[PDB]
Design an enzyme around this catalytic site. Structure first.
Site, PDB file in Angstrom:
ATOM      1  N   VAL B  80       0.849  -1.244   0.276  1.00 54.65           N
ATOM      2  CA  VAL B  80       0.116  -0.034  -0.540  1.00 54.65           C
ATOM      3  C   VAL B  80       1.243   1.351   0.394  1.00 54.65           C
ATOM      4  O   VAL B  80       2.048   1.148   0.914  1.00 54.65           O
ATOM      5  CB  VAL B  80      -0.461  -0.407   1.250  1.00 54.65           C
ATOM      6  CG1 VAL B  80      -1.531   1.588   1.487  1.00 54.65           C
ATOM      7  CG2 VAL B  80      -1.562  -1.333   1.335  1.00 54.65           C
ATOM      8  N   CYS B  81       0.375   2.669  -0.565  1.00 55.23           N
ATOM      9  CA  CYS B  81       1.359   3.161  -1.438  1.00 55.23           C
ATOM     10  C   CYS B  81       1.570   4.348   0.160  1.00 55.23           C
ATOM     11  O   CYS B  81       1.499   3.740   1.284  1.00 55.23           O
ATOM     12  CB  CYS B  81       0.831   4.170  -2.139  1.00 55.23           C
ATOM     13  SG  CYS B  81       1.134   6.211  -2.157  1.00 55.23           S
ATOM     14  N   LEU B  82       3.077   3.893   0.172  1.00 56.64           N
ATOM     15  CA  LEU B  82       3.449   4.953   1.884  1.00 56.64           C
ATOM     16  C   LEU B  82       3.206   6.266   2.247  1.00 56.64           C
ATOM     17  O   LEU B  82       2.739   6.828   3.307  1.00 56.64           O
ATOM     18  CB  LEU B  82       5.087   4.959   1.600  1.00 56.64           C
ATOM     19  CG  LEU B  82       5.779   3.727   1.478  1.00 56.64           C
ATOM     20  CD1 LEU B  82       5.232   2.712   3.441  1.00 56.64           C
ATOM     21  CD2 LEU B  82       5.448   2.245   0.121  1.00 56.64           C
TER      22      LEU B  82
END
Ligand SMILES: [Cl-]
Ligand SMILES: [Cl-]
Ligand SMILES: [Cl-]
Ligand SMILES: [Cl-]
Ligand SMILES: [Cl-]
Ligand SMILES: [Cl-]
Lengths: 160, 159, 158
Positions: B80-82
């Site tokens: 999941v996108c940081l």
């Protein structure tokens, strides 16, 4: 007792619900029924909470005390008072009073806060043998945390 | 030792949540159900959750182990996108809300952050209806409770 | 244009909530049930929700389409007091909590802000028990699921 309308509002919102709240003579002090969280050794327990709302609420946090006995590292065994430092880590002037009962206390009972324990013995047992401590908890809860013991822990003048 | 990481791990485990431990509090797998009212609703995923040494000042990392198609999720790795996590995470954030609020909301509609899955982002803006059908199909094949359980590394998978 | 407004609108729609769209993400209608344990508990209302071009830096506006009696709500227009919304709203506030937390809490007991409905404020202060009975009766006639549905502008009413 001074005219703090935020305290009055939050007290009334707490009472105007399905929560079991037993009033004193003032909005500053009352008793709230609390059930132990599911999946913990506290799960079959019922407690009565002595909640007080200070004159500078919500800038100062509420105080919370367990009236009938609970064994927990962050709770004073004799008095039932929940550690002020642990409350202050969560409380802010924007914090919702309902979340004390819905979030803060259930989470606290799931695993203690690492703050210097008010119940040193409970902290020691938890760290030495958690399985044995959990069994000790369940037994203590079955005897001290009945709906009946919670009800009778309300001071006589305000007990139904 | 990180006492906050320990605390939050233990609170997550001491609940009705399905949490599968590794050998340390720093890494574990959590069962996750897709939110109702979305093309994800019939899906089950396993989340690879990691809690860094400077938690909670640094956010946890979250990865979908079995396949998911979503603009903010790397299709190959499941991460999941940081940047998306960091918009929500603060040192005061409650770890349970990652599963209860942040992820369900994310799946309801993506965050406008530069997508990790650029195909999913383009399909979503070109033809929402067709994309939703594509998602439901993908979910019905890759996001079964069985596929979620099998995506746990063998060493820590219930036998 | 406004990607945050678009995102939050879509997340509200992609759920089990009952949301009735207009022609834009800026305006829509949301079904709302009164909170349990209050004189509003048997009530259903339709909310007119508007998300401004500078959302979420500017708060949404909320209006009760079918009639409600509440100190912080103008009954005629339906509009929820802007000052009360602004005490809770921040750019980091989650839109769902308007419906799940802010409005139910407001209905449990009013905010002390200068009332939009001065009549309701006076009744509440003078005799809370009588006012709660007045509320319950008003709610039973004006806050039916049918009245909530009919309060949606005809162009967007199902
Ligand atoms: Cl009182
Ligand atoms: Cl805590
Ligand atoms: Cl471990
Ligand atoms: Cl997001
Ligand atoms: Cl639209
Ligand atoms: Cl309010």
């Amino acid at each position: 007792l001074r005219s703090n309308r935020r305290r009055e509002m939050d007290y009334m919102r707490l009472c105007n619900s399905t929560r079991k709240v037993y009033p004193s003579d003032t909005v500053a002090e009352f008793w709230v029924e609390f059930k132990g969280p599911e999946g913990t050794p506290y799960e079959d327990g019922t407690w009565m909470l002595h909640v007080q709302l200070p004159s500078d609420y919500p800038f100062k946090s509420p105080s919370i005390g367990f009236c009938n006995r609970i064994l927990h590292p962050n709770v004073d065994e004799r008095s039932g008072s929940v550690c002020l430092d642990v409350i202050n880590q969560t409380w802010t002037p924007m914090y919702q009073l309902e979340n004390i009962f819905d979030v803060f206390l259930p989470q606290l009972l799931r695993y203690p806060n690492p703050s210097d324990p008010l119940n040193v013995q409970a902290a020691h047992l938890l760290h030495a043998d958690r399985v044995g401590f959990d069994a000790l908890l369940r037994e203590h809860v079955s005897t001290h945390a009945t709906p009946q013991k919670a009800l009778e822990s309300i001071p006589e003048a305000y007990r139904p």
